[PDB]
């Protein structure tokens, strides 16, 4: 085998995710949870995969650019091939998903996004869960999360407190596709 593609995103009050090619906020604790959720595997020795658009890859600091302990797939029609063994450039979403499903040591595909990547994942058969961090307020984003029918999902009822860093408040949400749930 089973292979799950889980989308992971942090949206503001207007569903915005990005502003001026970068993120509208800095939340170290939320980013630490992101790294944990996208890195940990039930079977050690197996790895997780992160599939991202070109602009997300460019928004990752070059010192951390190949996301450690995770196999990196970058969708791009323009970038040259990446010589690194942990990064691979895929020219289409279907080819990227096929390449990931071929690799046996990949446990879970974490769609970390870009709007087009989020939409493609939302239409993928491997779609399992959405891990949505809902941030309060309007950060005047220029790039947004795709429109999505939450009626396709079941919202997990675990107790979710409010979190706050640097006066920025947010809360975690987990949705599971109704086909699986
Ligand atoms: N808050 C969050 O959780 C969050 C998450 C992700 C991103 N963001 C923000 O949002 C922005 C990045 O997202 P974005 O939507 O602007 O861009 P993106 O999807 O990250 O990157 C777009 C690029 O990816 C490539 N691409 C996408 N789908 C493809 C496909 N099916 N086949 C081939 N190539 C494909 C193309 O590369 P070429 O241009 O080379 O063809 C395209 O121009 C930044 O502002 C970032 O900080 C925020
Ligand atoms: N929720 C949610 N938040 C996001 O920021 C986001 C992004 C963009 C992004 C994704 C990852 C990083 C990054 O390098 N992060 C880390 C930070 C500290 C320690 C380790 C890591 C690591 O992963 O190694 C930065 C930016 C895509 N999708 C997202 N979803």
Residue 30, domain CATH:
3.40.430.10
CA-proximal residue: ligand 1, atom 47 (nearest): 22
Instruction: Give the span between the Cα atoms of 14 and 43, in whole angstroms.
Output: 37
The ligand placed nearest to the CA atom of residue 23 is 1
Give Cα separations from 19 to 12, 22, 37, 117, 124 (angstroms): 11, 5, 24, 17, 26
DSSP 22: B
The ligand placed nearest to the CA atom of residue 21 is 1
55 is written with which tokens? Answer: 């602009």
Instruction: Give the span between the Cα atoms of 181 and 73, in whole angstroms.
Output: 28
Structure-token match 């087009």, residue found: 116
Q: Which domain holds residue 156?
A: 4-177
Residue 16, SS3 per DSSP: strand
Structure-token match 């091939």, residue found: 81
HSE, CB side, 13 Å, CA atoms: give it for residue 116. Answer: 10
**H or E element at residue 36:** helix 28-39
DSSP 3: -
Q: Given in angstroms, what resolution was this structure solved at?
A: 2.9
At 155, phi and psi to the nearest 5? -85, 125
Instruction: Give the span between the Cα atoms of 138 and 122, in whole angstroms.
Output: 24
Work out how many domains the chain is built from and give that number: 1
Ligand 1 atom closest to residue 113's alpha carbon, by position in its atom list: 6
């Amino acid at each position: 085998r089973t292979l799950h593609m889980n989308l992971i995103v942090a949206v503001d009050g207007c569903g915005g995710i990005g502003r001026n090619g970068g993120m509208p906020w800095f939340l170290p604790a939320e980013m630490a949870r992101f790294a944990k959720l996208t890195t940990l595997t039930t079977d050690s020795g197996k790895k997780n995969a992160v599939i991202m658009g070109r602009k997300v890859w460019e928004s990752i600091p070059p010192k951390f650019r190949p996301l450690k302990s995770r196999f990196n797939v970058v969708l791009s029609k323009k970038m040259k091939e990446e010589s690194n063994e942990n990064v691979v450039v895929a020219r289409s979403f279907e080819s990227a998903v096929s390449l990931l499903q071929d690799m046996e040591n990949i446990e879970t595909i974490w769609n970390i996004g870009g709007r087009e990547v989020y939409e493609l994942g939302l239409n993928s058969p491997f779609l399992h869960q959405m891990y949505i961090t809902r941030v309060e307020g309007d950060f005047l984003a220029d790039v947004f999360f795709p429109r999505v029918d939450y009626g396709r999902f079941i919202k997990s009822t675990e107790s979710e407190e409010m979190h706050e860093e640097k006066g920025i408040k947010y809360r975690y949400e987990i949705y599971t596709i109704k086909t699986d749930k």
